[PDB]
Enzyme design. Structure first.
Site, PDB file in Angstrom:
ATOM      1  CD  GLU A  35      -3.188  -0.665   0.164  1.00 60.94           C
ATOM      2  OE1 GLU A  35      -3.134   0.414  -0.469  1.00 60.94           O
ATOM      3  OE2 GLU A  35      -4.122  -1.475   0.021  1.00 60.94           O
ATOM      4  CG  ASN A  46      -8.952   6.567  -4.042  1.00 59.85           C
ATOM      5  OD1 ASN A  46      -8.027   5.803  -4.293  1.00 59.85           O
ATOM      6  ND2 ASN A  46      -9.351   6.839  -2.802  1.00 59.85           N
ATOM      7  CG  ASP A  48     -14.168   8.324  -5.025  1.00 56.56           C
ATOM      8  OD1 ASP A  48     -12.973   8.627  -4.824  1.00 56.56           O
ATOM      9  OD2 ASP A  48     -14.877   7.796  -4.147  1.00 56.56           O
ATOM     10  CB  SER A  50     -12.007   9.539  -1.786  1.00 51.27           C
ATOM     11  OG  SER A  50     -11.711   8.346  -2.496  1.00 51.27           O
ATOM     12  CG  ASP A  52      -6.620   5.665  -0.989  1.00 49.78           C
ATOM     13  OD1 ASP A  52      -7.778   5.686  -0.514  1.00 49.78           O
ATOM     14  OD2 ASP A  52      -6.356   5.271  -2.140  1.00 49.78           O
ATOM     15  CG  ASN A  59     -10.923   5.991   0.189  1.00 51.37           C
ATOM     16  OD1 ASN A  59     -11.004   7.204   0.036  1.00 51.37           O
ATOM     17  ND2 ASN A  59     -11.260   5.128  -0.761  1.00 51.37           N
ATOM     18  CG  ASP A 101     -15.827  -3.001   6.708  1.00 47.00           C
ATOM     19  OD1 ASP A 101     -15.477  -4.162   6.406  1.00 47.00           O
ATOM     20  OD2 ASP A 101     -15.679  -2.045   5.910  1.00 47.00           O
TER      21      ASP A 101
END
Ligand code: NA
Length: 129
Positions: A35, A46, A48, A50, A52, A59, A101
């Site tokens: 990562e 990203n 969209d 957003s 990271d 994110n 989650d």
């Protein structure tokens, strides 16, 4: 901060990531490697809009507030810049909420594509843990 491999493993273990939700320590070290290359200051945008953040590339769409991701959530109740610190506490505590989650470590695209199904214990070999 750029961590060494065993330095990060030791710090992740101290913060309780070893076998957290059943994921052995090597999974977390493998994920961080692909990562962020073990770099706490890593950022990536990203498609969209957003972004990271940090050693586990958390994110802003869901987990932190960076002031520039409208309509998003802040489920770890932190500013995203806290995830860039040399102190990885905030990253680890937020990662514990993510992995809980329902999707496990499949939340991290690099883990699923580069760690899952490999010998992840190799990532802690040679470390005094
Ligand atoms: Na957010």
């Amino acid at each position: 901060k750029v961590f060494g491999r065993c330095e990060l493993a030791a710090a992740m273990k101290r913060h309780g990531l070893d076998n957290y939700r059943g994921y052995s320590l090597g999974n977390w070290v493998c994920a961080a490697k692909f990562e962020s290359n073990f770099n706490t200051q890593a950022t990536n945008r990203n498609t969209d809009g957003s972004t990271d953040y940090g050693i586990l590339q958390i994110n802003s769409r869901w987990w932190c507030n960076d002031g520039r991701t409208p309509g998003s959530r802040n489920l770890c109740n932190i500013p995203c810049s806290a995830l860039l610190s040399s102190d990885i506490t905030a990253s680890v505590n937020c990662a514990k909420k993510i992995v809980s989650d329902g999707n496990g470590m499949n939340a991290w695209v690099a883990w699923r594509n580069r760690c899952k199904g490999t010998d992840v214990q190799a990532w802690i070999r040679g470390c005094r843990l």
